[PDB]
Short mmCIF file of C-alpha atoms and ligand atoms in Angstrom, two decimals:
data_model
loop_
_atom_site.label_atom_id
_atom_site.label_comp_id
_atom_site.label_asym_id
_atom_site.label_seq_id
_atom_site.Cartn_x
_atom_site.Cartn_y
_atom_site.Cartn_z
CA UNK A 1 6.90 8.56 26.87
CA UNK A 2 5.59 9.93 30.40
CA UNK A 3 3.56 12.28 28.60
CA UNK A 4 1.80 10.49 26.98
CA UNK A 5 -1.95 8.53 28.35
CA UNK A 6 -2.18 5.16 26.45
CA UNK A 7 -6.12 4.92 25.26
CA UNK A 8 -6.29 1.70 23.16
CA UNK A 9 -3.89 -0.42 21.42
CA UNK A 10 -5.03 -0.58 17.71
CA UNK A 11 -2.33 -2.35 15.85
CA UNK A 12 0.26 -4.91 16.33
CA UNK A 13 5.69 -7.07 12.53
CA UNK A 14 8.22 -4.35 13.79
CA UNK A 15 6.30 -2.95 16.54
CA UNK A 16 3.19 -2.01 18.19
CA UNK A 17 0.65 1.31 17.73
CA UNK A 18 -1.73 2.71 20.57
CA UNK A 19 -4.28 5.66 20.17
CA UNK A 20 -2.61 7.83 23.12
CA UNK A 21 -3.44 11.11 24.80
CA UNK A 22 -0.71 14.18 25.25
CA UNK A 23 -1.22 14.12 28.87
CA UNK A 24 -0.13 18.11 28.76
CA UNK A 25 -1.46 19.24 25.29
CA UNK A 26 -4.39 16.88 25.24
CA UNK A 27 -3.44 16.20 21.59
CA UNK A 28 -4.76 12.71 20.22
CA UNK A 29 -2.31 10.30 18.26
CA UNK A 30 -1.25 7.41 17.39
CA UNK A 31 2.01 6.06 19.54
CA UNK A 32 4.10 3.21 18.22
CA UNK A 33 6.86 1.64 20.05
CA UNK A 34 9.06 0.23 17.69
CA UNK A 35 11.29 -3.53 17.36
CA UNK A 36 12.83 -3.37 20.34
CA UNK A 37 16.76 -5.03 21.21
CA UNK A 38 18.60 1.94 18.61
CA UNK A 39 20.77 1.63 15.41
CA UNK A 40 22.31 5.05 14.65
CA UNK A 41 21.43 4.29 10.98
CA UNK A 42 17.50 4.06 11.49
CA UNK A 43 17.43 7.42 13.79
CA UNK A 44 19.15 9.11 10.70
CA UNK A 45 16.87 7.26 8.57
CA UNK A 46 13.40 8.13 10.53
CA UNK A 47 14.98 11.55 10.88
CA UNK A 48 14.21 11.72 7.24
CA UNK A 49 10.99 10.61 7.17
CA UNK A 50 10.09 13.44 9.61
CA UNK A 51 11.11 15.68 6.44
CA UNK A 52 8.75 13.93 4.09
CA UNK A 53 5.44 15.64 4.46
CA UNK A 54 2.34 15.47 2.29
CA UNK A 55 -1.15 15.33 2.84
CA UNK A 56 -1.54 11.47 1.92
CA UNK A 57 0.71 11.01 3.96
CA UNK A 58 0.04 10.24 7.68
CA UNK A 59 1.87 12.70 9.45
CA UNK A 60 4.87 12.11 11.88
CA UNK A 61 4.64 14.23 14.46
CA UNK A 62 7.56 13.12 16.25
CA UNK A 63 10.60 10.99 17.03
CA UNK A 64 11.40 9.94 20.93
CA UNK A 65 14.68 8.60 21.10
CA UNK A 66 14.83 7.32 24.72
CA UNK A 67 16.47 4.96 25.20
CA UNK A 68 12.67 1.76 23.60
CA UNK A 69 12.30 4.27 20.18
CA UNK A 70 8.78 6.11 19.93
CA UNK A 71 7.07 7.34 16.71
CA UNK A 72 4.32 9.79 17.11
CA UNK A 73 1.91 10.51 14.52
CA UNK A 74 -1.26 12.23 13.33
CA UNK A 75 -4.53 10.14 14.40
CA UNK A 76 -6.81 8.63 11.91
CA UNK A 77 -9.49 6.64 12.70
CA UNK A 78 -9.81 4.03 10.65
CA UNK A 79 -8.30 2.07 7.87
CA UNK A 80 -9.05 0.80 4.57
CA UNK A 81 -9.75 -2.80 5.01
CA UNK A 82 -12.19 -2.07 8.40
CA UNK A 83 -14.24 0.35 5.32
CA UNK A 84 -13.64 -2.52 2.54
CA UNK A 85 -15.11 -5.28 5.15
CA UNK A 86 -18.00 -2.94 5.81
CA UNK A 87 -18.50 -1.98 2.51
CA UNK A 88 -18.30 -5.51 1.21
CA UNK A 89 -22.16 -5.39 0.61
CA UNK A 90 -22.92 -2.61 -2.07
CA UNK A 91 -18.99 -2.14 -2.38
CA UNK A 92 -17.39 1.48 -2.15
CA UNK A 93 -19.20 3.69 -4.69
CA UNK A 94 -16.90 3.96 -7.86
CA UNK A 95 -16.44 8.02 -7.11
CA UNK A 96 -14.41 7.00 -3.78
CA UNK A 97 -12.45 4.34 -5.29
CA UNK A 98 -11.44 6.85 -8.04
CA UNK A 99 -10.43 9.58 -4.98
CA UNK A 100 -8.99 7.44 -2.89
CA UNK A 101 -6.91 5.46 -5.85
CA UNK A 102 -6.10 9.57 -7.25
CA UNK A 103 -5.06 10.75 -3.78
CA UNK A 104 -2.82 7.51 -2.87
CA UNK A 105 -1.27 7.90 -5.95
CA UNK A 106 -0.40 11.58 -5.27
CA UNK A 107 1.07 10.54 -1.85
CA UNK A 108 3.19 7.76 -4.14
CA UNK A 109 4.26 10.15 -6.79
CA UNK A 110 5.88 12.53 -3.98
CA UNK A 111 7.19 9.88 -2.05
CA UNK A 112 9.11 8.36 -5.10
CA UNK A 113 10.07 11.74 -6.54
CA UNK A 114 12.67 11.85 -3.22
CA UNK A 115 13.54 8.28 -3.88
CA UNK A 116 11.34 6.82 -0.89
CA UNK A 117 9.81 3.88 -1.42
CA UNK A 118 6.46 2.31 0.76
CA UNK A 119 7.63 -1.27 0.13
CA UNK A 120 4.09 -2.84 2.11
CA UNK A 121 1.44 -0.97 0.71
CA UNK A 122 -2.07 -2.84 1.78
CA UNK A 123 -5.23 -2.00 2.93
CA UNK A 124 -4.24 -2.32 6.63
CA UNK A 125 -1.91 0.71 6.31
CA UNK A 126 -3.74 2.91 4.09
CA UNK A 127 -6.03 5.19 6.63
CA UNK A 128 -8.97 7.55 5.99
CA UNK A 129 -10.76 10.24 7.75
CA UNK A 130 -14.70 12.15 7.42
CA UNK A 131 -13.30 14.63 5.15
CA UNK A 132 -12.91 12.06 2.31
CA UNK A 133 -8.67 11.41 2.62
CA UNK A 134 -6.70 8.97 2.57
CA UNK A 135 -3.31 8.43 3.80
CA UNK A 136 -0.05 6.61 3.53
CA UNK A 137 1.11 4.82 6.64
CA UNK A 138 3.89 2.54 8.64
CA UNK A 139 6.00 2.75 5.72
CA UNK A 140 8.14 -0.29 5.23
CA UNK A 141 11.54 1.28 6.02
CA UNK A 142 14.32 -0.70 5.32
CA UNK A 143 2.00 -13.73 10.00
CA UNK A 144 2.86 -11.28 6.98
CA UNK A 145 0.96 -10.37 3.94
CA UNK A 146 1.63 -11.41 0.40
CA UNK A 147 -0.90 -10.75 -1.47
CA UNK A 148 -0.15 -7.67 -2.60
CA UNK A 149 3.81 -8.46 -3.37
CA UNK A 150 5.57 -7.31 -6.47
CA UNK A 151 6.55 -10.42 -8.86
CA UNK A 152 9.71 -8.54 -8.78
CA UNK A 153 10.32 -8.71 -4.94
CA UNK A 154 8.86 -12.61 -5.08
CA UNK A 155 11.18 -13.99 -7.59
CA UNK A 156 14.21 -12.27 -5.44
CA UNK A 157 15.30 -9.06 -6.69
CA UNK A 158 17.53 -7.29 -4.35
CA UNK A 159 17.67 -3.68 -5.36
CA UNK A 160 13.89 -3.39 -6.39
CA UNK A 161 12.39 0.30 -7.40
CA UNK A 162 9.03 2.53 -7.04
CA UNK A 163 7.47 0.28 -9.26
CA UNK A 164 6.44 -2.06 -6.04
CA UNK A 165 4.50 0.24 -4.73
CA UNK A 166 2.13 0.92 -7.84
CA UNK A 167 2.04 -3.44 -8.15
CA UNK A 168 0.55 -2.97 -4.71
CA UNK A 169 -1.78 -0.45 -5.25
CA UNK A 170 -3.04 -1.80 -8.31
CA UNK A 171 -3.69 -4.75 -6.42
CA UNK A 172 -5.52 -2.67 -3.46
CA UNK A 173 -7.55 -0.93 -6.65
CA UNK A 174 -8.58 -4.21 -8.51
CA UNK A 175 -9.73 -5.54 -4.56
CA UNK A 176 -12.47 -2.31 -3.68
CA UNK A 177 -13.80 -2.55 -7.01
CA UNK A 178 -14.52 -6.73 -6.99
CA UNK A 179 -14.28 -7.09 -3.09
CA UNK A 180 -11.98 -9.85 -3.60
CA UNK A 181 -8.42 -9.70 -3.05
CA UNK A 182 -6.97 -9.95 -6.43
CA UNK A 183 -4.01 -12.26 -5.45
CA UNK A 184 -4.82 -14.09 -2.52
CA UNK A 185 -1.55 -16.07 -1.53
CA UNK A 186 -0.81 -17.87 1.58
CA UNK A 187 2.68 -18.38 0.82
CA UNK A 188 5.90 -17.02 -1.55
CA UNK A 189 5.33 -19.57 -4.61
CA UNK A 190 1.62 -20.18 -4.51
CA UNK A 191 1.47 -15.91 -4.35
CA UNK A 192 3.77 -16.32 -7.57
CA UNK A 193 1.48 -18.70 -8.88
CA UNK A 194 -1.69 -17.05 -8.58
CA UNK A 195 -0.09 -13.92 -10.27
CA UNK A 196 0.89 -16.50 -13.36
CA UNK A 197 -2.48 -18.12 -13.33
CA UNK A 198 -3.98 -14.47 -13.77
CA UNK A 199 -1.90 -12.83 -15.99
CA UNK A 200 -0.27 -15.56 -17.38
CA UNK A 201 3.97 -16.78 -16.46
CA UNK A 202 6.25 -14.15 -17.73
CA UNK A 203 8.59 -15.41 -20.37
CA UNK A 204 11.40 -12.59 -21.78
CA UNK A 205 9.02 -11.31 -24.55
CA UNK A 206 6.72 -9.46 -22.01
CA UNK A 207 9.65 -9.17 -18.99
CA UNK A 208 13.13 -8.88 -20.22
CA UNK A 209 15.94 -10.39 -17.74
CA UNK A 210 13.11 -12.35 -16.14
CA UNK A 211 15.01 -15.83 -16.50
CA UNK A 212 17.60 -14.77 -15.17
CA UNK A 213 16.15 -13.34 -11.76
CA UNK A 214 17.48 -15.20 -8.71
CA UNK A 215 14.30 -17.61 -7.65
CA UNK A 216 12.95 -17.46 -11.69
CA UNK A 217 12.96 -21.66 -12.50
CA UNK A 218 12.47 -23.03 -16.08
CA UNK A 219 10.40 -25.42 -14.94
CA UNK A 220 7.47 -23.38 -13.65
CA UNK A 221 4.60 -24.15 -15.05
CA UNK A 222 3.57 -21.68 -17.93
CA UNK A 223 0.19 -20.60 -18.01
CA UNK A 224 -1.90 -18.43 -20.19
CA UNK A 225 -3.03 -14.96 -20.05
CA UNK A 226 -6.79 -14.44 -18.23
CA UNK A 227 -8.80 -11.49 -20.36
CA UNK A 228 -8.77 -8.93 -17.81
CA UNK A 229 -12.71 -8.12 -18.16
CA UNK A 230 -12.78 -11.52 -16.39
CA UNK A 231 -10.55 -10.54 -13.57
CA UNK A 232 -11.82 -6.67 -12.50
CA UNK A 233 -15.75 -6.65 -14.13
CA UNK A 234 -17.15 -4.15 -13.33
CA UNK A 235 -14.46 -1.91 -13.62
CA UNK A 236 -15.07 0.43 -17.21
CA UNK A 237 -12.77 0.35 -20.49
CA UNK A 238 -10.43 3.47 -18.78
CA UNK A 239 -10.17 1.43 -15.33
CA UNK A 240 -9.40 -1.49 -16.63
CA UNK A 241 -6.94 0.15 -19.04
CA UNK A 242 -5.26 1.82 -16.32
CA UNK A 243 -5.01 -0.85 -13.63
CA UNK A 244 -3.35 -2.90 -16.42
CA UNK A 245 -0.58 -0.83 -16.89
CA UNK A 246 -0.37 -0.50 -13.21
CA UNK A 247 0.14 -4.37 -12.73
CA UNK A 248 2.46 -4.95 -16.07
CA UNK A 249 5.34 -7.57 -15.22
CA UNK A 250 8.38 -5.24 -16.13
CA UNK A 251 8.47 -3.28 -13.53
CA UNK A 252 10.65 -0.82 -16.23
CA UNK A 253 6.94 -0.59 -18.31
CA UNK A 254 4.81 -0.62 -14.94
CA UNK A 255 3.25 3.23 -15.33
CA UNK A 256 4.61 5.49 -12.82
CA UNK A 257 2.39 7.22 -10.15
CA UNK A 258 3.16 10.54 -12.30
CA UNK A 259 2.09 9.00 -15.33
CA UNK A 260 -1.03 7.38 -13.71
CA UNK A 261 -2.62 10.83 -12.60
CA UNK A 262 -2.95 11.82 -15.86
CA UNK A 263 -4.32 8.64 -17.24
CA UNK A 264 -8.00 9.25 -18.89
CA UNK A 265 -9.04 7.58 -15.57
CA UNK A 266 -9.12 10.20 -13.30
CA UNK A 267 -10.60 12.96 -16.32
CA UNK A 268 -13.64 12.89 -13.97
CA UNK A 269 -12.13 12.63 -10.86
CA UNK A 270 -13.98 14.43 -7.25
CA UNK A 271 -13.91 13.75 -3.87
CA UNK A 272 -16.67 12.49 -2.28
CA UNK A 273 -16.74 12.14 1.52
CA UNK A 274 -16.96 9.05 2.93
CA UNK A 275 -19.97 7.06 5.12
CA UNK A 276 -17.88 6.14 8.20
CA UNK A 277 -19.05 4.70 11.76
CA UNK A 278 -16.44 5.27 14.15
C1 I19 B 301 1.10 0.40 11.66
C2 I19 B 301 0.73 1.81 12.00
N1 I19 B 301 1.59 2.76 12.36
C3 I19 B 301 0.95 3.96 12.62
C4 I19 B 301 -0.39 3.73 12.39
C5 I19 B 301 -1.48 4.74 12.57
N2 I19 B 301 -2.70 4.30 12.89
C6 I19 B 301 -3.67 5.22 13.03
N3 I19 B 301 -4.99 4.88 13.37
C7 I19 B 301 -5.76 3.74 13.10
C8 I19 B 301 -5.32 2.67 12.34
C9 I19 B 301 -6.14 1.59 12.11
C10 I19 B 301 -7.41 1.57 12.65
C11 I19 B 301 -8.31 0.45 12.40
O1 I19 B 301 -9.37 0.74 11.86
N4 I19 B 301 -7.98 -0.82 12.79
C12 I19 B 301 -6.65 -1.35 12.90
C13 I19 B 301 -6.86 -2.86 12.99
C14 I19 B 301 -8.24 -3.15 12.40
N5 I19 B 301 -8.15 -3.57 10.97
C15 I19 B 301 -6.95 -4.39 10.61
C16 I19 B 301 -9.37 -4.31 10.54
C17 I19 B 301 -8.95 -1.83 12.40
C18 I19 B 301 -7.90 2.63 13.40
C19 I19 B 301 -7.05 3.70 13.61
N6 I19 B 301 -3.47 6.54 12.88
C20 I19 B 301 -2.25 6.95 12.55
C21 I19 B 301 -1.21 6.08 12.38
F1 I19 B 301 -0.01 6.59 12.05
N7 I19 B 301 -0.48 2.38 12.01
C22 I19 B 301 -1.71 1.69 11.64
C23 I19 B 301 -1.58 1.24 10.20
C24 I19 B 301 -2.10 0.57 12.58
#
């Protein structure tokens, strides 16, 4: 860590991230010192991480060990909810929500093709640059977000899958098209409940093994489906088509991210660059 000039702390659950200077190489990155009390299981297990490269994904440069574990990365200078927040006006054109939604889901499909999952996908660890990519970040590697929680995950299942991580992202989606977080809960059951009010309480007919998931009750309250033109307007007929497959219940009929790219969706897709003041 001597080598290394802190600039700025930009982050702060499992530890915190500074934009830092290579005091030899004058190399710019992003420095996090990780949850402190190292495990020989997580050094194996960031070890492969350093393996898993991709262009959507934010690059780990490298791994200090000493003695206090550091986590070097690529830089990026800003993330996705900073650009949501000051986009929040006109909203991000609908070209750069298609990109960014094309790109993330490229960075997902290789991820989950070597049985990685993101677990926390949300806007605050998605990052972009001024060449129009965006990029995977602080991957959840096993006060906290749940708005963008699988129903999965919320009603207790222990050995969950890569279908999380397209829940989340379909959440992130529906949220730069309306500018509203689709799911806004401030807690486990009312998170829960907000998905249910939406898309209505899932009963075995559209989830399978549902009842029987560990926090599933028979006495929550059932409501009906919303029309989905009401939830994401004004998201077109392919959009809207998509993002519902992207947020179905099961997560064994959620689309993959493989599937996804070739959804009629993306037909048109490009890659505008974004308007960024850093
Ligand atoms: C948790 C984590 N590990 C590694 C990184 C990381 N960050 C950057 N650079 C970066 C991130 C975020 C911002 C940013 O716009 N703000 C963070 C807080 C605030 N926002 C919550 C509104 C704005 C600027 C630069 N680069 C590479 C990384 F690996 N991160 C970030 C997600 C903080």
């Amino acid at each position: 860590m001597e080598n290394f000039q802190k600039v700025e702390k930009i982050g702060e659950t499992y530890g915190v991230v500074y934009k830092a200077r290579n005091k030899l190489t004058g190399e710019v990155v992003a420095l996090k010192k990780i949850r402190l009390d190292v495990p020989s299981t997580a050094i194996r297990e960031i070890s492969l991480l350093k393996e898993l490269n991709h262009p959507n994904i934010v690059k780990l440069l490298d791994v200090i060990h000493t003695e206090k574990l550091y986590l070097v990365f690529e830089f990026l200078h800003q993330d996705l909810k900073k650009f949501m927040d000051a986009s929040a006006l006109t909203g991000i054109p609908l070209p750069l929500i298609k990109s960014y939604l094309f790109q993330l889901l490229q960075g997902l499909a290789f991820c989950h093709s070597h049985r990685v999952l993101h677990r926390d996908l949300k806007p605050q660890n998605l990052l972009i640059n001024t060449e129009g990519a965006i990029k995977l970040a602080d991957f959840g590697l096993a006060v906290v977000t749940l708005w963008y929680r699988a129903p999965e995950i919320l009603l207790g299942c222990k050995y969950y899958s890569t279908a999380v991580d397209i829940w989340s992202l379909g959440c992130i989606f529906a949220e730069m098209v309306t500018r509203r977080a689709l799911f806004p809960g401030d807690s486990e059951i009312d998170q829960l409940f907000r998905i249910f009010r939406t898309l209505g309480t899932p009963d075995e007919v559209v989830w399978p093994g549902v009842t029987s998931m560990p926090d599933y009750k028979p006495s929550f309250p059932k409501w009906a489906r919303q029309d989905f033109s009401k939830v994401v307007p004004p998201l077109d007929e392919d959009g809207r088509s998509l993002l519902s497959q992207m947020l179905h219940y099961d997560p064994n009929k959620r689309i993959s991210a493989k599937a996804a790219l070739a959804h009629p969706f993306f037909q048109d897709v490009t890659k505008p660059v974004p308007h960024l003041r850093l």
